[PDB]
Amino acid sequence: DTICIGYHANNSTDTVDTVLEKNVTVTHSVNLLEDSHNGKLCRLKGIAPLQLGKCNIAGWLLGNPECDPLLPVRSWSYIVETPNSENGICYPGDFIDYEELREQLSSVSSFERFEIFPKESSWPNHNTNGVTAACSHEGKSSFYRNLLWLTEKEGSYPKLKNSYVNKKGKEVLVLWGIHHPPNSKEQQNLYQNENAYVSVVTSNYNRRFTPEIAERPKVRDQAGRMNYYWTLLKPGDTIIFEANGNLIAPMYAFALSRGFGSGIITSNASMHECNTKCQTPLGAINSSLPYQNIHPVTIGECPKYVRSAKLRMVTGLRNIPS
Amino acid sequence: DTICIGYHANNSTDTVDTVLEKNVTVTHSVNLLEDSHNGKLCRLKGIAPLQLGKCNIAGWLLGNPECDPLLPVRSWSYIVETPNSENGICYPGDFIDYEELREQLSSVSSFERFEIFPKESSWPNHNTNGVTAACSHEGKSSFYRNLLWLTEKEGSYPKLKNSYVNKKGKEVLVLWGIHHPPNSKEQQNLYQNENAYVSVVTSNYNRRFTPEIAERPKVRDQAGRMNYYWTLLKPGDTIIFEANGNLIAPMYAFALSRGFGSGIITSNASMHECNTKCQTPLGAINSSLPYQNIHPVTIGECPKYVRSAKLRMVTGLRNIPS
Amino acid sequence: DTICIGYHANNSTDTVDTVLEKNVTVTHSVNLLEDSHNGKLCRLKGIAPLQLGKCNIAGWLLGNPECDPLLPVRSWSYIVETPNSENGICYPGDFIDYEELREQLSSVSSFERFEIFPKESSWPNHNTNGVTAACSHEGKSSFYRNLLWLTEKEGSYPKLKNSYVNKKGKEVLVLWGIHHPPNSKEQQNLYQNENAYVSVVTSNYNRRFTPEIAERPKVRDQAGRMNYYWTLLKPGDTIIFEANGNLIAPMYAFALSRGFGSGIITSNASMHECNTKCQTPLGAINSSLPYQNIHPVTIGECPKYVRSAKLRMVTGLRNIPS
Amino acid sequence: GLFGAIAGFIEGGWTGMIDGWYGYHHQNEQGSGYAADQKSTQNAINGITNKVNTVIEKMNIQFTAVGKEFNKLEKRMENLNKKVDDGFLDIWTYNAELLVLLENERTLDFHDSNVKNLYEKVKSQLKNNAKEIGNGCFEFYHKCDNECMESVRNGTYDYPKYSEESKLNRE
Amino acid sequence: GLFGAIAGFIEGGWTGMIDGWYGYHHQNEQGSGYAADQKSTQNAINGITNKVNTVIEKMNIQFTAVGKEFNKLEKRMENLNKKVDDGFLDIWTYNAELLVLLENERTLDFHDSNVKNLYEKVKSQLKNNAKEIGNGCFEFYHKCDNECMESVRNGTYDYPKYSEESKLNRE
Amino acid sequence: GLFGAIAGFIEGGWTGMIDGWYGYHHQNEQGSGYAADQKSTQNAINGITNKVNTVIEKMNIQFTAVGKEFNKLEKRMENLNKKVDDGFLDIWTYNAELLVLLENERTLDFHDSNVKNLYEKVKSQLKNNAKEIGNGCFEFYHKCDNECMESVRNGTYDYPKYSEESKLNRE
Ligand SMILES: *[C@@H]1O[C@H](CO)[C@@H](O[C@@H]2O[C@H](CO)[C@@H](O[C@@H]3O[C@H](CO)[C@@H](O)[C@H](O)[C@@H]3O)[C@H](O)[C@H]2NC(C)=O)[C@H](O)[C@H]1NC(C)=O
Ligand SMILES: *[C@@H]1O[C@H](CO)[C@@H](O[C@@H]2O[C@H](CO)[C@@H](O[C@@H]3O[C@H](CO)[C@@H](O)[C@H](O)[C@@H]3O)[C@H](O)[C@H]2NC(C)=O)[C@H](O)[C@H]1NC(C)=O
Ligand SMILES: *[C@@H]1O[C@H](CO)[C@@H](O[C@@H]2O[C@H](CO)[C@@H](O[C@@H]3O[C@H](CO)[C@@H](O)[C@H](O)[C@@H]3O)[C@H](O)[C@H]2NC(C)=O)[C@H](O)[C@H]1NC(C)=O
Ligand SMILES: CN(C)[C@@H]1CCN([S@@](=O)(F)=Nc2cc(Cl)c(C(=O)N3CCO[C@@H](c4ccccc4)C3)c(Cl)c2)C1
Ligand SMILES: CN(C)[C@@H]1CCN([S@@](=O)(F)=Nc2cc(Cl)c(C(=O)N3CCO[C@@H](c4ccccc4)C3)c(Cl)c2)C1
Ligand SMILES: CN(C)[C@@H]1CCN([S@@](=O)(F)=Nc2cc(Cl)c(C(=O)N3CCO[C@@H](c4ccccc4)C3)c(Cl)c2)C1
Ligand SMILES: *[C@@H]1O[C@H](CO)[C@@H](O[C@@H]2O[C@H](CO)[C@@H](O)[C@H](O)[C@H]2NC(C)=O)[C@H](O)[C@H]1NC(C)=O
Ligand SMILES: *[C@@H]1O[C@H](CO)[C@@H](O[C@@H]2O[C@H](CO)[C@@H](O)[C@H](O)[C@H]2NC(C)=O)[C@H](O)[C@H]1NC(C)=O
Ligand SMILES: *[C@@H]1O[C@H](CO)[C@@H](O[C@@H]2O[C@H](CO)[C@@H](O)[C@H](O)[C@H]2NC(C)=O)[C@H](O)[C@H]1NC(C)=O
Ligand SMILES: *[C@@H]1O[C@H](CO)[C@@H](O)[C@H](O)[C@H]1NC(C)=O
Ligand SMILES: *[C@@H]1O[C@H](CO)[C@@H](O)[C@H](O)[C@H]1NC(C)=O
Numbered sequence A, B, C: 001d002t003i004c005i006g007y008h009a010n011n012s013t014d015t016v017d018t019v020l021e022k023n024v025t026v027t028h029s030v031n032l033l034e035d036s037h038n039g040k041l042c043r044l045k046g047i048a049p050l051q052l053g054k055c056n057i058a059g060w061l062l063g064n065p066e067c068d069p070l071l072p073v074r075s076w077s078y079i080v081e082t083p084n085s086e087n088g089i090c091y092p093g094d095f096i097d098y099e100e101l102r103e104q105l106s107s108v109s110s111f112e113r114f115e116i117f118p119k120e121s122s123w124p125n126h127n128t129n130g131v132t133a134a135c136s137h138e139g140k141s142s143f144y145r146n147l148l149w150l151t152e153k154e155g156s157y158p159k160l161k162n163s164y165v166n167k168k169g170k171e172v173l174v175l176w177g178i179h180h181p182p183n184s185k186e187q188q189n190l191y192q193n194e195n196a197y198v199s200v201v202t203s204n205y206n207r208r209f210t211p212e213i214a215e216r217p218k219v220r221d222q223a224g225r226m227n228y229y230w231t232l233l234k235p236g237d238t239i240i241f242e243a244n245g246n247l248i249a250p251m252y253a254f255a256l257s258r259g260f261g262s263g264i265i266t267s268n269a270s271m272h273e274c275n276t277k278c279q280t281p282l283g284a285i286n287s288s289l290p291y292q293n294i295h296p297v298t299i300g301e302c303p304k305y306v307r308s309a310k311l312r313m314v315t316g317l318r319n320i321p322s
Numbered sequence D, E, F: 001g002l003f004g005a006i007a008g009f010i011e012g013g014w015t016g017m018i019d020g021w022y023g024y025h026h027q028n029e030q031g032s033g034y035a036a037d038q039k040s041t042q043n044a045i046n047g048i049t050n051k052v053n054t055v056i057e058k059m060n061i062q063f064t065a066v067g068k069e070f071n072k073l074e075k076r077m078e079n080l081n082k083k084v085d086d087g088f089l090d091i092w093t094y095n096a097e098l099l100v101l102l103e104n105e106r107t108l109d110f111h112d113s114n115v116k117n118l119y120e121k122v123k124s125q126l127k128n129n130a131k132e133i134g135n136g137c138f139e140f141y142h143k144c145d146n147e148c149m150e151s152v153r154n155g156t157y158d159y160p161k162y163s164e165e166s167k168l169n170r171e
């Protein structure tokens, strides 16, 4: 009569690595590294993202006419730009503090696009119909949907002055532009004044702009330039615009709501009728594992990105079947 | 006759955690996590801090008259701002590179406030008595204790020019301001010149300022603006001020000494007659433990901040009494 | 008859540290910490560095005449500045975005110095021979080898305009300067125009410069100032210079090639006929060890810098000889 | 292994013991069979589940982490942002891979110790009433029936009950 | 435990042994009492003090570390500064908690090994002059007086001196 | 050590055994000599080479890493860049020093376990045909020639072959 002491073995082919030994076959093991995603863009915590389509952030905020117009109010959990993004700034120039504005938008969860200076009542003494071939739409010269190109009316460009008081209870993002003609003949024709200036003031913003006339290499067939500026008008504050030329006046502004957990990503994945707690530019992750090797860019509640190809903890024994 | 082998047990109720087991009761243990402080502001290595009282850094450096004047020379180990800080800039405007100046002050251990341009001898041809309701003091209009509001004298504002040679052997911090009236009638009344300018030059600083006239939303009941500027005048260097208007001239400057281990903190704790090697905005830490969970902001020689609630090493055995 | 079980001992005096015990003498051990270098500057992966000699980056790029002229085309693996660097900017002023330019140069592997605006054909109506004592050479007044000091010719300074189209297929770095005389008499004498301006435009660069006249503390015996600017002209783009005064015009520009693994270091070590995979400012490292304590600054493929003085893994046993 | 039982003096495992990690095989006149040691297996399961949950718990959730954009004159800041992102990724990949390797070694030693201690428990109970025959097996010097088998599996082997019979068979 | 002594075949500890971590209890005709093993306890104290000081020494002093301020147009830099501060805090909390957990497991195994080796030292000395009676206790097959007790506690048990007497009592 | 063999019940090492980490010394009528145990030594060499290569492999190559320059109005950014460089250096020096200390402790325990298991293999083979005489040595109760010595060194000691002779000499 005998009694023997022994240990479990099975048909498992799981392998793990240790400090002293690679490729140890074990009876039981647990994977800690998430490597699967669904290849889709999904709702994040029940909120659909903001897809910009053919526009980047600049094109959407200025209102590039080649992009499908968005609904007046949108709320989202993240912003998606496509890698193509054929449509951004269409009249060449500088977008001042553009990257700062993108960082601002990353904590924004909602916008309300409203008419800050209505077209037909704000500028009775100026021409508001200026368009350019650089911002064409359906093969016809057009202009930004949120801005107005003011030029002289009846041979005169009176000194204008308009203000807006923010009674929205939210930050209002205001965008405008400064045009720099390539020669003084165009400057005099468009704005009738050579020592023209633009002034924009609020309680914490104070800047003056002056045209700088020079002929430049043509960009999108334009030797002129258009510099774009922005500020966040605090609740209750007033913004005053003053100019005797060259102002690309605001027409629509955005009332912005602040949120948490958002950001901007680039993706060629497609929106689908799904929901996730974790979204990457390649797809959504449905997992409780502590690590993932799918993508370093994540939205929501996600596993930690690591470069490893395998992270397996042994739970059982070394597997030695007879 | 028998002999037995055994191990120590006692009445200890200390518990520790291990990888395989939580809440193991052990005979002896050592705590590594400091969680106690004295709730006071103390001297750091035998040096008292600089308390700004009702002023922030801007109010102290400009000399806001609502703050208790400091002694001509101070030396400190850290700077304390109160969370309230009701007094900063009192005439609205922009403080250019303010955050950079605060970072500079963080390695400063001493100041000497001295008259760089004495009031009664520097500007014989200009009015130096200008005050404003925005910087009131005891219910009366006043102005910064370190700056002088130069305006026209007898209907004339002569082009001024004054210089200072730094013979202190230390960096001299010089502060000045540029006033921007809300309309040209005020500009002509105060400074008599419409194309006014201010020039400030040293061996490594070279800047020109020009008024930008526009009416703006009232801030502290002022539609005008005052932009504040600063530079560090190296030992032996000269600073030259040139203006025909709008200059808010320096009166007092600071000779600065550089030190180590300092910084600026915000605290509503009280100064006490104590000494410490480690100071946090909540209180001082008297400890040799390697970790603390009291506050991430520390001055001096401190334990490393971690988020943990408990860090206990077992030194004894598993406690199994009969 | 007996049989005994035992373990190896030898004459080794290697010591290692463990968690429970310091200074354990062991039979075999491996060192993991590289502490030896050759004290020389070497070729990195078969490419010699760019040594700037007596010049820093600014002096080389502007062409300070006190530095030995370099060959028209150079290719390198890293840039060496000497700690002395007696020669940089020789006419006092500001080098705008100098640190950004240095960061740009850190990923550059090659330059081609070519004449962008030839001296004898570009400015027929202006004087191009201006020199200064601040940039002397062999005890005689001189000027930057890459820039031209344009001044009035025959009592007239005509409005100039010159352009260059980048047909190099590589980024072209263009450098120029703006002179600020200390008084209006010098401004009128040198450039004949008081409301002078300089304009530099490309497809993505658009800036205007204006002299700011004031007398300043003398730096290198000059009360005037010279501000230096730069831009990267993209392949195929055009740069247009426009001025009626004060322009320090480009003469030579650089066609730049982009590379990997490069950087700028400071060293007083000497170039030698050696080759390395790892270069530090103190010398080259020939090692496969994972750590080094020689210097935190490394070029190439190097061990990780740590502060430790010793990192020894025991491979053998505790050494207990009889 | 560190304790010499698994892949040591007990060369192989048992595919026939499906109900536990460690246990016994017996053979007497009433038959043979496997029997997992429920106490040591369950204690091992609890500790290892504790180890795995600790690894998961120590890694916080990664909340939203996206990139930032920089213009052509912010190269230094862009490289600093990249150095920060690269450096953190370096450390976490280092931490994750090492922790798994270190804990994997300890887990295998943990099972090895449990098998070894299980063998020692039986050996200390039987004394000279049975003989070690290698490969973790004991041959009894007396008739060991199912109830006597069970007394070994739990803590209650009655050594005096069989010493007289075992002493006779030892010679 | 890994070595099976503490909470293993020696089920409980001794509150009556106040002078050391490991030791002996004896009982003969001259009485009974506890006696800590000074050598193993002191060696254990030295090693553990070494372990604790190593943990403290590996953590450098935290010199002055305060925040920085950013204006409304420096949001990217402010978030980068926060990402750096958050990331370092993540790693150090991770390092501190794991190191304590890992070292806590090793410390308990260290004590378990010391008790086990202490028991083995006595067992190898006595051979068949005494019998294992479980719970880490030995019953002598001969009269074992205080001097003989002390010879076991230090390294000098005289096995031949009692083999004849022990052999008679073994039967 | 954790397993009690090195610097334990086997007090010292052998300078005369130059060909391996663990092994045997024998003495019979045909002479004496050392003999390294090739299997355990080679297995130990493989595992430790594996450990060292793992430490090297886990540390990536450090590609080009130089400093950055900042003007007089970029002090905050310069301090942030320095905080990042200092912090990463803090963690890596911490990681490197701890890993070496932790692995050094495990390596010494690894050798201690191998010696202990080697001694147990011989002890389980010989049973009562020889006697433990301390310091890791056994004295045979029978004539043990070179072939019999070799049967102990590999796995093939023939216990029944000498039980009769050993039983006579045991008394
Ligand atoms: C990690 O370990 C596993 C299992 O030990 C390895 O896979 C196994 O590899 C062996 C040998 O290559 C295969 O067994 C036999 O191979 C011989 C020729 O070498 C052949 O004649 C036999 O018919 C038999 O297949 C075995 O099939 C295979 N098992 C699998 C793949 O499940 C694996 O290669 C190891 N990885 C390493 C060392 O990187
Ligand atoms: C960590 O371990 C300690 C000690 O093992 C735990 O505290 C102890 O908890 C037990 C049970 O809750 C208490 O013992 C008995 O509780 C029963 C009811 O469960 C009651 O009828 C008895 O009168 C007796 O109190 C014991 O008092 C208590 N000891 C303390 C608090 O010092 C502790 O709860 C554990 N923590 C965990 C598992 O998170
Ligand atoms: C680390 O361990 C080594 C070796 O154990 C230490 O070096 C050795 O130190 C001892 C004592 O200092 C030296 O041995 C003897 O010293 C006595 C006086 O103490 C003297 O009278 C004898 O002649 C003999 O030299 C031994 O020479 C020396 N061995 C060396 C240096 O190779 C070392 O000091 C230890 N380091 C520590 C504890 O920090
Ligand atoms: C994915 N992730 C989020 C989760 C979070 C929770 N853990 S958890 O700790 F529960 N994982 C484990 C996964 C596994 Cl396969 C095991 C294990 O070896 N078993 C399970 C218990 O019967 C063991 C057995 C079966 C047959 C014969 C003998 C023994 C085998 C263990 Cl012990 C733990 C993972
Ligand atoms: C706070 N910090 C800055 C310091 C820096 C220095 N260390 S230190 O390593 F010394 N800490 C220790 C703290 C403790 Cl309670 C112990 C321990 O278990 N003992 C102390 C020695 O008699 C042991 C004993 C008593 C009675 C019966 C049996 C055994 C119990 C140890 Cl061994 C070390 C902590
Ligand atoms: C520098 N670096 C880039 C490299 C990358 C590769 N490793 S490597 O793992 F191979 N290093 C080792 C270095 C050493 Cl000295 C050993 C060791 O103890 N030996 C070597 C084998 O005979 C052992 C012995 C000799 C005589 C008697 C008994 C035993 C002693 C080992 Cl096992 C590994 C280091
Ligand atoms: C351990 O196993 C033994 C052997 O089966 C158990 O002892 C028997 O228990 C049953 C019921 O408790 C009695 O009817 C038998 O008479 C017992 N056998 C003897 C020889 O006394 C014992 O109960 C088990 N202990 C446990 C499971 O804790
Ligand atoms: C170990 O303990 C034994 C037993 O007490 C000690 O042996 C005795 O030592 C004293 C004085 O040294 C002598 O008078 C006795 O005659 C010894 N007993 C015998 C049987 O010889 C021994 O000294 C102790 N060794 C130590 C403490 O190192
Ligand atoms: C283990 O060692 C024994 C003892 O030397 C070896 O047994 C001898 O092997 C040789 C050749 O194989 C035979 O001629 C002898 O007759 C064997 N001795 C006995 C007593 O049978 C054995 O081969 C070794 N096993 C190995 C090395 O695997
Ligand atoms: C997305 O882009 C990547 C490369 O940028 C490409 O490999 C992939 O196929 C694209 N996927 C889709 C759905 O367009
Ligand atoms: C300091 O402020 C905190 C909140 O900002 C408050 O909870 C605390 O009571 C205050 N302490 C004192 C002494 O004012």
Ligand SMILES: *[C@@H]1O[C@H](CO)[C@@H](O)[C@H](O)[C@H]1NC(C)=O
Residues within 6 Å of the ligand: C083, C268, C269
């Ligand atoms: C390089 O400079 C350091 C100090 O800056 C000095 O100690 C060293 O001797 C110098 N070496 C040479 C070769 O000049």
